[PDB]
Design a protein around this ligand. Sequence first.
Ligand SMILES: *[C@@H]1O[C@H](CO)[C@@H](O[C@@H]2O[C@H](CO)[C@@H](O)[C@H](O)[C@H]2NC(C)=O)[C@H](O)[C@H]1NC(C)=O
Ligand SMILES: *[C@@H]1O[C@H](CO)[C@@H](O[C@@H]2O[C@H](CO)[C@@H](O)[C@H](O)[C@H]2NC(C)=O)[C@H](O)[C@H]1NC(C)=O
Ligand SMILES: *[C@@H]1O[C@H](CO)[C@@H](O[C@@H]2O[C@H](CO)[C@@H](O)[C@H](O)[C@H]2NC(C)=O)[C@H](O)[C@H]1NC(C)=O
Ligand SMILES: *[C@@H]1O[C@H](CO)[C@@H](O[C@@H]2O[C@H](CO)[C@@H](O)[C@H](O)[C@H]2NC(C)=O)[C@H](O)[C@H]1NC(C)=O
Ligand SMILES: *[C@@H]1O[C@H](CO)[C@@H](O[C@@H]2O[C@H](CO)[C@@H](O)[C@H](O)[C@H]2NC(C)=O)[C@H](O)[C@H]1NC(C)=O
Ligand SMILES: *[C@@H]1O[C@H](CO)[C@@H](O)[C@H](O)[C@H]1NC(C)=O
Lengths: 71, 228, 213, 48
Amino acid sequence: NVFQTRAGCLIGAEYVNNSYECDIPIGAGICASYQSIIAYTMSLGAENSVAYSNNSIAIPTNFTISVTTEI
Amino acid sequence: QKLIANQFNSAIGKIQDSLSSTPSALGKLQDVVNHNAQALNTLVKQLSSKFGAISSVLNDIFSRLDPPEAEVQIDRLITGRLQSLQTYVTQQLIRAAEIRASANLAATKMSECVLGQSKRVDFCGKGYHLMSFPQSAPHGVVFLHVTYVPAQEKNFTTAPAICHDGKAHFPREGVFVSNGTHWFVTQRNFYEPQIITTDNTFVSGNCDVVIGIVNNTVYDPLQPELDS
Amino acid sequence: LPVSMTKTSVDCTMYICGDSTECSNLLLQYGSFCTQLKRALTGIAVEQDKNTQEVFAQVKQIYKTPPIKYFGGFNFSQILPDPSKPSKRSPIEDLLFNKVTKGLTVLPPLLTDEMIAQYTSALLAGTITSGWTFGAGPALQIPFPMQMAYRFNGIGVTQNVLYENQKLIANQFNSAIGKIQDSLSSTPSALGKLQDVVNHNAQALNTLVKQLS
Amino acid sequence: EIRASANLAATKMSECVLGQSKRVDFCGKGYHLMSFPQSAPHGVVFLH
Ligand SMILES: *[C@@H]1O[C@H](CO)[C@@H](O[C@@H]2O[C@H](CO)[C@@H](O)[C@H](O)[C@H]2NC(C)=O)[C@H](O)[C@H]1NC(C)=O
Ligand SMILES: *[C@@H]1O[C@H](CO)[C@@H](O[C@@H]2O[C@H](CO)[C@@H](O)[C@H](O)[C@H]2NC(C)=O)[C@H](O)[C@H]1NC(C)=O
Ligand SMILES: *[C@@H]1O[C@H](CO)[C@@H](O[C@@H]2O[C@H](CO)[C@@H](O)[C@H](O)[C@H]2NC(C)=O)[C@H](O)[C@H]1NC(C)=O
Ligand SMILES: *[C@@H]1O[C@H](CO)[C@@H](O[C@@H]2O[C@H](CO)[C@@H](O)[C@H](O)[C@H]2NC(C)=O)[C@H](O)[C@H]1NC(C)=O
Ligand SMILES: *[C@@H]1O[C@H](CO)[C@@H](O[C@@H]2O[C@H](CO)[C@@H](O)[C@H](O)[C@H]2NC(C)=O)[C@H](O)[C@H]1NC(C)=O
Ligand SMILES: *[C@@H]1O[C@H](CO)[C@@H](O)[C@H](O)[C@H]1NC(C)=O
């Protein structure tokens, strides 16, 4: 259970090919979390390819009144 | 109107539930308080350090030694404690400057997002900003940004202009769309088809220069009236 | 605009006393200065990471540009990522990278340059394909010339000015972007606002080390 | 100082990039149309 990272050598956690959001930042794109303790490469976000074309548009048809908090 | 009111009420209810059920959402203000307390505690711990003197209590130094070298010991103790106090004051000054910057940002937000409407993106909430409400909190302010977000988008075919009788008609405020066979004009942020007439479109030049223009007729409201 | 500096950490006892045990024994009774300094430096490091995350991670989606890169005459090849290069970077940012050069440790940043480049590519694809709607909800695709016509309507010029001069505007934009590329490749001090940052931090460390003499 | 500059850069990214800003001289000299971000060592370069 030894992993080599750019920051250094990590012992006690197993690398996982799966990707999630960062929970405990380790560095160099590596984040660790407890689910056993697993370290992984953090996931930037859900990929979304938009179909762009030169004669098509997308028009909204409905709305939502959202409320957000800022402290 | 009724649907918007219902959405607003549901939104504020969800905000209340989220604030009730999430303790970490109020981290920022909490952090502030903690920091100050921590600093004070650290300062107290500095009174428990000998700083290289034979004892950390002034009474012991005085009752145990004569002035000639008790003054040296007390010199060491005083200089150490003075250095600790200097460090604490400097940290307080830096934290106060940071809080001053945060307070200036909060004042700007209160002046603009509240008492007004802001065209600045994301400055007063995610999405198109509608309005906001302030609330007080221990050592801080909480803004409720009420905002408008589009949803349920639909595909359409678009043309930059309409060539009719050799004239190029451009939309005045909206955009041309096509549900497959017919051509309408609708505003940018909402779907509401309208017949392409000579009041919501304006004429500019001929239809040989624009790229992507399409052929269609432009209804004229004056012609039926003049027919009678 | 600079965003974050080098994250540094200090081992207080090792820097102060080195490998002398009696020095550490004498040191432990000066109090919690070492704890204070470690706490301050850790705070600075996490603040740097938060700064980078806040400035770049502003979108929850990673948009991808369509394979057919034709936008009505506009040429974005100078700023879009280059598939051939293994680093996945545009010529401009590659030029920027090439134009910028114990007890104390330097911690690597949480987000590597590759993830930052990925965020920049996502932002560029979003703002090219879908205008500015992707920053206010869902992504709404729209032809690029129409987006530019909308932007002229933003500054009080009707669309017929654009649609009748589209080719000229495209040529001017391409020439301007080429001139910017050459100007960046030519002026060495143009990146000073970043360079001095490094030229500050590193030299500061040097001075600290000199204090051991 | 660097954190203040980073806040300014975040504001510029949020306004000049993800939208069109009518503030004079905030997003380049002249009437602002749009902008592009680019990464750089310990910084960000905006093309207005
Ligand atoms: C726009 O969205 C609203 C809500 O998101 C829709 O209102 C809902 O309509 C369904 C069916 O009529 C009802 O079962 C729900 O109770 C309604 N929601 C609310 C909050 O009242 C509305 O129909 C949508 N508009 C269109 C044109 O589809
Ligand atoms: C508008 O049309 C495009 C293509 O005609 C739609 O894009 C497709 O969306 C589905 C939904 O999952 C994908 O499975 C396809 O792969 C997409 N096609 C392409 C070429 O990317 C788009 O969804 C339509 N817009 C709406 C609002 O439905
Ligand atoms: C596009 O919209 C037009 C306008 O509503 C549709 O034309 C109407 O369609 C309804 C539904 O069958 C008819 O009852 C009307 O008589 C039609 N009016 C005209 C003037 O043709 C058209 O069908 C829509 N396109 C599609 C593919 O449904
Ligand atoms: C829109 O209408 C114009 C004229 O009504 C079309 O122009 C004609 O196109 C045909 C076929 O190319 C030629 O034989 C005629 O000589 C053209 N006449 C004129 C006056 O230009 C035009 O082609 C139509 N648009 C489209 C897309 O077909
Ligand atoms: C867009 O710009 C790029 C570069 O600015 C053009 O690529 C050039 O193409 C010519 C002829 O094919 C070559 O001689 C140059 O060496 C290319 N430049 C580079 C940097 O490789 C490209 O042709 C332009 N147009 C399109 C549609 O991409
Ligand atoms: C418009 O797009 C289609 C396919 O996306 C392409 O075949 C066509 O050449 C494009 N037109 C122009 C003028 O670029």
